[PDB]
Symmetry: T
Subunit: 152 residues, 12 copies
């Protein structure tokens, strides 16, 4: 039982809804001397990945699929993980979580680029490549914030 | 007993379920009114997402801790959701939307009364502004369905 | 015996009479302050037309039916109008404007009391916002006339 | 009618005030599947014909006249008709009322174009011509909405 | 020896250059309690009538003519009059001069509208009508500033 | 013989041929004035496409039916076209452009007279405005060519 | 047989036929969805005119010569046109639009494969971007028609 | 013995002292967060200058006379100021800022109660809106300091 | 015994007193020129607040420490202030404004000379630019008062 | 002897002659560079008109009285003008423009020296800024003519 | 050359810094009838290729590389050539230098498109493709300025 | 023995080395202040590229010939560069930035002295304006490092 382009895209709809909720979690709960800069930065990421999510869902529609569209479906299909905010985290801890999710998305998107190349879906292939370009840039910048190299 | 913090957190959950429902309608709608209502759902997605952020951050400002996971939202919301399995007419989708707007209207009225009793003037006026917008939306979408606002 | 719906509809009529008066002043004014006050009347025309629309649509949203003909506006308004037949000074025109602003202020105060008593919080806060703007205008136009706001 | 340029312009001040109030009536009371589009559309018309009304009144001032400026005067003088909204009307009925008033204004403006041509008031003549150009376009579009040819 | 369309347009090039210089004179030398409003208003008129002047000159070019283009030519052909500012004038006096020049331009433009109608130059005719529309509005407003009716 | 509707439709055809010609010049031009005139052709393309739309919709508004296929445009246009096979200098391209502008000027003059006679004041003033712009373009492009506007 | 230059030129022809068709629909449409779809056709006209310009200029940049007359467009296009004689419903007009979008999708797919084979990476990615937009349009207009995107 | 007019005038004084303090912090701050917080102080300077103007002009509109000299501000303010004599850390400057924000919050709460008791609905809602913003700022600057809003 | 740092700090004090005076005039003015001059005072408030900030930050950049409390401003300013106790005419308020502008002009002339003598080229040119603006304002406000600039 | 007021008035006259010359070039130019230089003359007309207004109003601010009639401008200007009688090449027109720019440059240098001697720091720096722009223009228009700036 | 994706990108950082300085040389030293148009045009190119340079350097960072960041490194590594402006050049000669460098960058970018395709770096591949699209358009337009076909 | 032309050309070289250094810092910086300072370096890159262009074009306008190759910039600059080979802290990078700003400040002071002595008033005021900005930057970046501006 293989995963085709429709199944991959729907999986990323689920992932991206979990991810945007996580971005809001960080936005709301962060504390520390870098608050103002990172508080705004989370708004930027929230918009960007919400747009990605919409575009993925509507590409899935355009190839004849049916996107997940309830919280229950997102939780049942996402590989991105979430956790309630119970005890105080440092800013560095929150950014480590963010970067970890960005790396997860990068690697899964690479799987989807290979898949859509194989299946001959050139539109979806280039869409995913553009998304990955942005993700790679974000990983460099947030790793730099943490004092690390991009692929470290 | 439900206090101001608990009410606001309940609405964080509700509003997250609701914006996802708005996207469901946006994506799955069909029919002659597609282009108009397709765009309208984007307008609503933005407005109620903003409401959600403002509610969560008012909760923070009074010393609370907003729900912030899909699991919590589903565990706590009173807004209902369902997977899109069978085709729905545009009228059916707008009836779902209107029903959820009416639910939020009535719950916001309960929260206005609660915050008025407790003396939280800021939260009270925030909820009042939200309800003003919701009431206008109910009038307009009921009009689309050929009905009066309170019918 | 006057409820919130009847009050709001009364102000629909008042505000239509008032905007026509603002245009009368806009067109017929003369004197050294012409250019500034000519533009100012456009600002007021827009603001109070917006007020009128918001009032009518709030009346709709609470289940009412706004007056929507000149015949109804004349039949129901408490704002007064008179044809421009003989020359008036700029001060006389602004005294008429300020007198009408004072009428609207006091009637809006009655409606704030009414809606606070009947429990319509959305309409109540709407009227309070309008009154804030009207009070500022009264200060400024009294200042133009060389007077304190409440004299 | 037995009307010179000043009397014609003042007549249109009265008409246009009745018309803008009618546009608001339709804006407020309309119902049906076409609500959102036409609801906004009537804001467009309200702005345009209020601007026309101001321009007509101020051209009347500029040629030495005195515009009507009370509701009593508008009602006593307008040929545009109004009626209270008492029983439900379909969207098609509301647009038929709108179109009927647009046709009335078109034909009266044509009378004014001829009159101002004869009297030698070239400014007023060209002003009315521009207004009629817009009215004619509106008539085509709203008849099309109703499924009819522009002059049917 | 009749005046044709080319000669009329060139005459108005001269007039409008004299007029814009007069507007600057008023802008610079005015005093009194209405200074700020009228100081800015003169900038508005300066731009508007400079644009009129450019459009007149380039319409003259487009019909095969050659516009005056030196101060000497403007002074030798304009009917608009100018005078050095030697003794203090009141604001009302300056606006009376402005209105007088506006009325001169209105009446000459009316002559040109008749002329171009007769000669069959429809473009120039409608250009002049549009200009006259604006002039008539200005005359109403500035007469109102002076406490007078537009045609008084 | 030719009435207002037939005249306007003839110009719909002409203007479609003309905008395609403007694109030909835009694409194939070479020489030291490339960048300026390349952009200039974009300006004309927008302007005369807008003219074409306005003419077609005026024709609709007076009860007519605009041509709306390439076959009809070629069948009715008096503007001439030629495939780009041998290289043309910038001056040859601009002389073709100017020649077509002069054709449109003269035909628009005929339509101005016709609509004047028929009493169609709206169409008359529309064509006059168009001709004003065309005359300005003729002056400027003739100047580019080192010539007087009517030479 | 067909190389990249010939493919691109074929699409210059197609896109000119298509934009003229979009104007036909813009002008002749009637029905309750008039205002929304009238504006929508303006959006498509701009988008596919831009596509046409980009294709023609890519053809220039790889050493080719774009078609640039109505005669050539009609001689080479596979997009079909018909004069508007009998009245068409809004659904018929939208089905014609959608049919042409599907033609362009399938032909663009052939060009994507061809340019991939020939090693023209720029042209390949250009056509992919165009096809992304076309696929979205097909989904939305099929939805307007009450159909699934590939039905 | 403090009425609405006296409360508002007290806040005119407080807000002038506060904006000058904001400039002190803007000018003298040092440390790694310099650029971000330097800009942030401009934002606060604008917001609370706007508040000061609105308070003074509301005082005018109810018949009062705002303090309008540095001497009056100093004689009446409850907000404290001190010359910058020795270097302070960014955290110390932000703790001073937050302390003044908390002072303004608590005094506004008193003014909301007072104006509610006296029946000044406009002034009451103005103070509520201001307090909403102040509470949000307290949450954000406390977060910067590593603390909960009410800690 | 006054150097560049002391001169600049003296002007920080002067400019804070001045902007508060501008607000006094803005708030308390009455008469026929109310609307125009009311807005004009906002313009001056912004310009001279900007000057004050630039002066303080230039003082920082040359190693100085700007006054940053109302007490310091009052202890050091040469600009005068007085409480608004009895009504003043618009002409009296503008005469006060002009008097302060002339004071600032003359002191700046001294500062231009001082900084030229001390070799501070940046500060010298900053003061020259400010004085250019002040001189223009003196001409305009004197004109409002019916006087020549130096009368 | 020429003092600062006399110098500035001389430049009011010069600049009025110059802007009229710029329009002459704008209107009468022909040749291949028409569109570029036609627009460029509008840019110059605006810039030197602004210079003229600033010079006249600086003269007002120092107690002077600017020339304000065509007769005065012609009586006092050193910039020369001539009617356009015979065709001029674009190069000839730009040589006239450049010659006038060089005249203004040299006269402005004399005025910079004069105002430096007299101690008018504001006027001095104003003239310096003007000369900076003039020098840049001379470089660019000399480059157009194929020459170095000072050749 | 014997070059992987990181080395290719760094080579283009060096090239693009040499190129932007060349664009300024042309901007500053050009003379002739086409001065104003091409003077502005080079500002356009300076912005575009400086942006390209930044994007290339930051993609290099995002894949774990280290961009050259000194003039010494740029000179030691670039294949784009530069020469001091000593004797006068015609506008055509300057544009021939510009076009020659654009052709060099086009061909090297093509090498990088092939290389990144082979190595599986899809993001970098598509980035380079977009850049080459722009370069090819520029080559057509500047050859047209010179009176030549794009590939002549 | 160094005149104005030689000084300006020296600063052309310096400013090109400096902008490349700004990009080095932009690309290689790491640490908690990354996002703010990353953007800040773009601001500086633009500003000092603009400075460089203005200096080169002023040199042209006074008859000079700017350096325009990397080889010339390296041969002539006094600003230092070093490859980024081992990790540096944000403080170290900003200390390098500030050191270069101080070099440019002091050299610009030398050029201000030089041009004031040689009588080039335009270049003199240009350099003074640049120095004003540089001095402000020195204050702000020293503040970031926790230091006073001139330590
Ligand atoms: La599967
Ligand atoms: La920001
Ligand atoms: La989207
Ligand atoms: La999107
Ligand atoms: La969407
Ligand atoms: La492949
Ligand atoms: La394939
Ligand atoms: La493939
Ligand atoms: La509880
Ligand atoms: La819309
Ligand atoms: La928000
Ligand atoms: La918000
Ligand atoms: La909000
Ligand atoms: La937020
Ligand atoms: La209470
Ligand atoms: La009752
Ligand atoms: La204004
Ligand atoms: La509103
Ligand atoms: La509204
Ligand atoms: La409304
Ligand atoms: La009465
Ligand atoms: La009363
Ligand atoms: La209550
Ligand atoms: La309230
Ligand atoms: La819309
Ligand atoms: La108007
Ligand atoms: La008006
Ligand atoms: La009736
Ligand atoms: La006639
Ligand atoms: La006549
Ligand atoms: La006639
Ligand atoms: La004659
Ligand atoms: La104004
Ligand atoms: La113009
Ligand atoms: La114009
Ligand atoms: La012009
Ligand atoms: La006629
Ligand atoms: La005729
Ligand atoms: La005729
Ligand atoms: La016939
Ligand atoms: La341009
Ligand atoms: La149009
Ligand atoms: La249209
Ligand atoms: La149009
Ligand atoms: La020829
Ligand atoms: La006629
Ligand atoms: La007739
Ligand atoms: La007739
Ligand atoms: La006409
Ligand atoms: La030639
Ligand atoms: La073949
Ligand atoms: La729209
Ligand atoms: La394009
Ligand atoms: La193009
Ligand atoms: La494009
Ligand atoms: La069908
Ligand atoms: La391949
Ligand atoms: La390959
Ligand atoms: La390949
Ligand atoms: La690709
Ligand atoms: La259907
Ligand atoms: La008391
Ligand atoms: La910021
Ligand atoms: La305010
Ligand atoms: La205020
Ligand atoms: La105290
Ligand atoms: La104290
Ligand atoms: La502490
Ligand atoms: La502490
Ligand atoms: La001392
Ligand atoms: La204003
Ligand atoms: La500042
Ligand atoms: La500052
Ligand atoms: La004292
Ligand atoms: La004192
Ligand atoms: La006095
Ligand atoms: La006195
Ligand atoms: La003398
Ligand atoms: La331009
Ligand atoms: La100015
Ligand atoms: La200026
Ligand atoms: La200026
Ligand atoms: La001025
Ligand atoms: La001195
Ligand atoms: La340009
Ligand atoms: La970038
Ligand atoms: La960057
Ligand atoms: La070499
Ligand atoms: La591949
Ligand atoms: La692969
Ligand atoms: La591959
Ligand atoms: La030497
Ligand atoms: La920012
Ligand atoms: La610059
Ligand atoms: La520059
Ligand atoms: La430059
Ligand atoms: La060193
Ligand atoms: La040193
Ligand atoms: La000196
Ligand atoms: La200076």
């Amino acid at each position: 039982n293989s995963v085709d382009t429709k199944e991959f895209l729907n999986h990323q709809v689920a992932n991206l809804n979990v991810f945007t909720v996580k971005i809001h979690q960080i936005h709301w709960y962060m504390r520390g001397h870098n608050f103002f800069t990172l508080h705004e930065k989370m708004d930027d990421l929230y918009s960007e990945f919400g747009e990605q999510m919409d575009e993925v869902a509507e590409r899935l529609l355009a190839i004849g699929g049916s996107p997940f569209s309830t919280l229950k479906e997102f939780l049942e299909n996402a590989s991105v993980e979430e956790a309630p905010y119970t005890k105080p985290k440092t800013m560095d801890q929150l950014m480590e979580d963010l970067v970890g999710t960005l790396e997860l998305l990068r690697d899964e998107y690479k799987q989807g680029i290979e898949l859509t190349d194989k299946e001959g879906d050139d539109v979806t292939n280039d869409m995913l490549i553009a998304f990955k370009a942005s993700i790679d840039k974000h990983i460099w910048m947030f790793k730099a914030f943490l004092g690390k190299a991009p692929l470290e």
